Structure formats: structure tokens, C-alpha cells
Amino acid sequence: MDDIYKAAVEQLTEEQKNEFKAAFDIFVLGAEDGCISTKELGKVMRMLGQNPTPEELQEMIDEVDEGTVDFDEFLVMMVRCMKDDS
Ligand SMILES: [Ca+2]
Ligand SMILES: [Ca+2]
Numbered sequence: 342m343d344d345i346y347k348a349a350v351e352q353l354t355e356e357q358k359n360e361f362k363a364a365f366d367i368f369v370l371g372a373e374d375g376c377i378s379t380k381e382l383g384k385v386m387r388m389l390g391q392n393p394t395p396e397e398l399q400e401m402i403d404e405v406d407e408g409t410v411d412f413d414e415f416l417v418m419m420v421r422c423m424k425d426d427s
Contacts, residue, residue: 346413349420358416364388365415376409385415391422 342350353361367388368381377385379402386393393401401418402410410418 342413343407346417349417350413352420352423353416361389361416361419362412365412376411377415379408379410382410382415382418386419386422389419391419393418393422397422397425 350358364385365377368377368385369375379398382402383393383395383398401421405414405417405421407414
């Protein structure tokens with residue numbers, strides 16, 4: 342795990358990580374695919390109760406990505422988005 346991600350991911354409980362993984366898993370053929378598309382990214386986030394804006398999704402992709410998102414990238418983007426609730 343990348344050390345910077347490792348600390349975003351430290352915000353999450355084991356249970357949150359498990360929940361987040363179950364939602365992510367809906368959007369891949371896990372037997373052969375480890376990444377969701379950038380279009381699916383907002384879908385999985387919204388499944389988990391987040392409401393990222395279109396500019397924000399592109400910004401997170403620019404800043405987090407190592408057109409695709411794997412599970413740890415997804416966790417970091419969830420953590421970022423969870424901090425913009427009002
Ligand atoms: Ca729970
Ligand atoms: Ca659940």
C-alpha cells in the first residue's frame with residue numbers, strides 16, 4: 342500500500358472497508374477485473390451515500406490515480422468525499 346493512501350484508509354473502520362468492498366464488487370467481474378471505470382466511480386460512491394460532483398470526480402482522478410480506479414484508489418476517494426458532508 343502507498344504510505345499516503347495508507348493514512349486516508351486509516352480513517353475507515355474494518356466494517357466500513359468491508360461495506361465499501363461489497364459495493365465496489367458489484368461493478369467489476371472480480372474473477373478477472375480489479376478496476377472500475379471512471380463512470381462507475383460516481384455510481385459506487387453514490388451507492389455508498391456520497392454525492393460527488395462532476396468537477397470533483399475529475400479532480401480526484403487527476404490527484405489520486407496511480408480511465409480506471411482500483412479498490413485502494415476507490416477507498417481514498419471515498420475518504421476524501423466523506424469529508425465534504427454538510
Ligand atoms: Ca455498518
Ligand atoms: Ca450493507
